[PDB]
Design a protein around this ligand. Structure first.
Ligand SMILES: Nc1nc2c(ncn2[C@@H]2O[C@H](COP(=O)(O)OP(=O)(O)NP(=O)(O)O)[C@@H](O)[C@H]2O)c(=O)[nH]1
Ligand SMILES: [Mg+2]
Lengths: 424, 218
RNA sequence: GAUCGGGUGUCCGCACUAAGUUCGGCAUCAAUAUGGUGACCUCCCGGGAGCGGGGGACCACCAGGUUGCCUAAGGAGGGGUGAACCGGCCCAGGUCGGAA
């Protein structure tokens, strides 16, 4: 154990250890991996009763059994010796308490280096099983509904319940809060403001639509082409789907239908929707690079790159797709996944994001930047495909397709999707 | 001439599994890497029904390409031992098989450091191979579970890799200083347990062609 | 800004590479501490037999605790046959010993 910090959940360092040698090295990266990213090996132990976190830094992962016994005795001596300072609601009990735990830890560390030489989980057991069987039947991935349920027996273990609460309604509630915060990815988006920033180098805005076969990449690409034209934007559809029959005439019917609603006469006199196509059988990274150089020269604010649908287990073809998105450097990689897929929503995005970073040759690789959740009008409340997607990926559901026309494109109501999923 | 061994291993692991912790996939990419380096360059060890020892001699080291063959033997036996460290948490006998792959990963890297001692290789790959040996000897004597023999070949690997940084440009020193910083966390743990007892080029000299000051001429 | 330098990537029965796509061949080490199994050899001791009590010797396989003058790699993996007499075991009937 080279490191040990104990702070509260309100972000207040109570006590820290870094050895007599220098001091206080890496207490912030310790907090980040251990509390920030969970809602030298850097692990943690949570006291959820009194809102404490016990972050430790060690090597030789095989000594994890004695490092866990040292966090358990330090956690038992800390919450007993300072039970008065940590049990009060006021943050002025911890600001005014004196946590001189250095001589108690040096004794628990030197003594654990000789061994090397309320709400329990039994109560919350039955309701975490009825909630896991409700998420799975409401189309949350089978294992996403298992980690979700265990994030809640952890969060409420030790904690006292309200004046009017049961075992059932507590794990049922903190599972809704751990589900809205994970369906709240660490990302945001914008509009014309974002193409003014793409004009800081005088270049268009290139979005890449990727995904598995039949989800709605081409049809929702046309709902977003109608949504960009509605905001006054000219969009050049790059037809890089050269692995199918009628993949260019599908996009040419979308360009004929969109250059009818938004013609040059009703736009100022200039072309606003135009298809860039090179036929079938051509390279999809060569038609895409020609359409970015063509939209720059012909003045198209947006390029919407349509790619062919593929599986998730194709080493010679997820190589060519991951190399396309790595090299083309698109502004927003939009994974298109249907709201009808079940447990495959996890395997699609994990292999789609693992490919984009493997066959990438950068330091920080270009990963999927969002999700388009299509066929939303087909599940009717079996909505757990939105949770399975923003769970594994910490990327937002940029659009939610709700039909086949251009007007069936919605923003995500992520609050009522967890309220429908956590109500059983 | 040159070989960036550290850049070779780091971008082959992040691309073939080790970003998500797949040592079984990284070793299989290492074995297919070596088979296809052997089938292309016609450097097969055995023929059908017989085996002959592969000896990478000094004459074939001009290619700047056969050092990657022995390195893919060092990275294959290293990747197998790290996978056997995850399977030894539930099968503690797997540790005996782990330590037999790490003694032959330093032996390939000690035979690959002796090959780089040739005069046909620059002053960059002799020393990337010298201290890739001293890094695998500090990880084997760290898995010996002796904390003292672990900081002896880690402070040796740190002092070698730092002697290589100071000798060249601070831009090429970045690779050798990235590897002293790469093995520096392991040195703080063994010191805690000893004392326990054509590119685009612009012709910017055409913008310098201008008139002399014509104030004295009026 | 007329011709146009100066230079590339589309066209090839092409040149060399070697993340994958696919089916085969060959091949796959050894020593220790502990216990176990199966056989076999050689002594005592009791009995009217089938048998019962005990002392050693040797062989193979086996479990799992340390290991190597061990590998190009050598798991203490998973299975199946174990029969027309040759693994062990539980062995109906039958059968041999017995008054039983
Ligand atoms: N009901 C409904 N249907 C949708 C939605 N999004 C797409 N679809 C339908 O799903 C079908 C698939 O269309 P398409 O756009 O070609 O999907 P794709 O992913 O491009 N297929 P490919 O792999 O061949 O490129 C179409 O019939 C389309 O209308 C949606 O939100 N709701
Ligand atoms: Mg398509």
């Amino acid at each position: 154990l080279d490191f040990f910090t104990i702070f509260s959940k309100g972000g207040l360092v109570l006590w820290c250890f870094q050895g007599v040698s220098d001091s206080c090295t890496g207490p912030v990266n310790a907090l980040i991996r251990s509390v920030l990213l969970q809602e030298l090996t850097l692990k943690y132990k949570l006291d959820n009763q009194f809102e404490l976190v016990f972050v430790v830094g060690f090597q030789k992962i095989l000594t994890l059994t004695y490092v866990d016994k040292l966090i358990d005795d330090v956690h038992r001596l800390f919450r007993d010796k300072y039970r008065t300072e940590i049990q009060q609601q006021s943050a002025l009990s911890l600001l005014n308490g004196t946590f001189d735990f250095q001589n108690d830890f040096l004794r628990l560390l030197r003594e654990a280096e000789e061994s090397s030489k309320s709400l329990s989980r039994e109560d919350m057991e039955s309701v975490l099983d009825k909630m896991r069987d409700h998420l799975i039947a409401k189309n949350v991935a089978a294992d996403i509904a298992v980690q979700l349920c265990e994030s809640v027996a952890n969060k409420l273990e030790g904690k006292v319940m309200g004046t009017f609460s049961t075992v059932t309604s507590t794990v049922k509630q903190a599972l809704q809060e751990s589900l809205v915060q994970i369906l709240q990815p660490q990302r945001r988006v914008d509009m014309l403001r974002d193409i003014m920033d793409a004009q800081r180098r005088q270049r268009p805005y290139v979005v890449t639509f990727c995904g598995v076969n039949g989800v709605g990449k081409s049809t929702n690409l046309a709902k977003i082409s109608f949504w960009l034209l509605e905001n006054g934007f000219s969009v050049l559809i790059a037809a890089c789907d050269t692995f199918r029959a009628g993949a260019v005439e599908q996009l040419r019917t979308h360009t004929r239908r969109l250059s009818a609603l938004h013609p040059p006469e009703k736009h100022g006199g200039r072309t606003m929707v135009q298809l860039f196509e090179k036929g079938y059988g051509k390279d999809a990274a060569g038609i895409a690079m020609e359409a970015i150089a063509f939209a720059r020269n012909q003045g198209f604010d947006v390029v919407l790159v349509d790619t062919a649908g593929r599986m998730q287990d194709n080493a010679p073809l997820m190589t060519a797709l991951a190399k396309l998105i790595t090299v083309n450097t698109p502004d927003l990689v939009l994974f298109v996944g249907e709201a009808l897929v079940g447990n495959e929503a996890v395997d699609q995005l994990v292999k789609f994001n693992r490919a984009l970073a493997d066959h990438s040759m950068a330091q920080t690789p270009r990963l999927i930047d969002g999700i388009v959740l299509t066929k939303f009008d087909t599940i009717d409340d079996k909505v757990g495909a939105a949770i399975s997607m923003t769970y594994i990926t910490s990327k937002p559901i940029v659009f939610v397709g709700t039909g086949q026309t251009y007007c069936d494109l919605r923003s995500l109501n992520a609050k009522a999707v967890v309220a429908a999923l956590m109500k059983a | 001439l040159s070989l960036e061994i550290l850049q070779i291993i780091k971008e082959s692991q992040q691309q073939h599994g080790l970003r998500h912790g797949d040592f079984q996939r990284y070793r299989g990419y290492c074995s297919r890497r070596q088979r296809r380096l052997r089938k292309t360059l016609n450097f097969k060890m055995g023929n059908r029904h017989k085996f002959t020892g592969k000896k990478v001699t000094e004459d074939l080291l001009t290619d700047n390409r056969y050092l990657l063959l022995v390195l893919m033997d060092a990275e294959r036996a290293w990747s197998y031992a790290m996978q056997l460290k995850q399977e030894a948490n539930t099968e503690p006998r797997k540790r005996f098989h782990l330590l037999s792959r790490l003694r032959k990963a330093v032996k390939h890297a000690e035979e690959l450091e002796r090959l780089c001692e040739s005069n046909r290789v620059d002053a960059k790959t002799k020393l990337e191979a010298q201290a890739y040996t001293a890094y695998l000897s500090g990880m084997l004597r760290f898995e010996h579970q002796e904390w003292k023999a672990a900081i002896e070949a880690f402070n040796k690997c740190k002092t070698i890799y730092e002697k290589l940084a100071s000798a060249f440009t601070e831009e090429q020193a970045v690779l050798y200083n990235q590897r002293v910083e790469e093995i520096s966390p392991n040195i703080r743990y063994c010191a805690y347990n000893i004392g326990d007892q054509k590119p685009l080029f612009f012709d910017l000299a055409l913008n310098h062609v201008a008139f002399p000051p014509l104030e004295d001429k009026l």
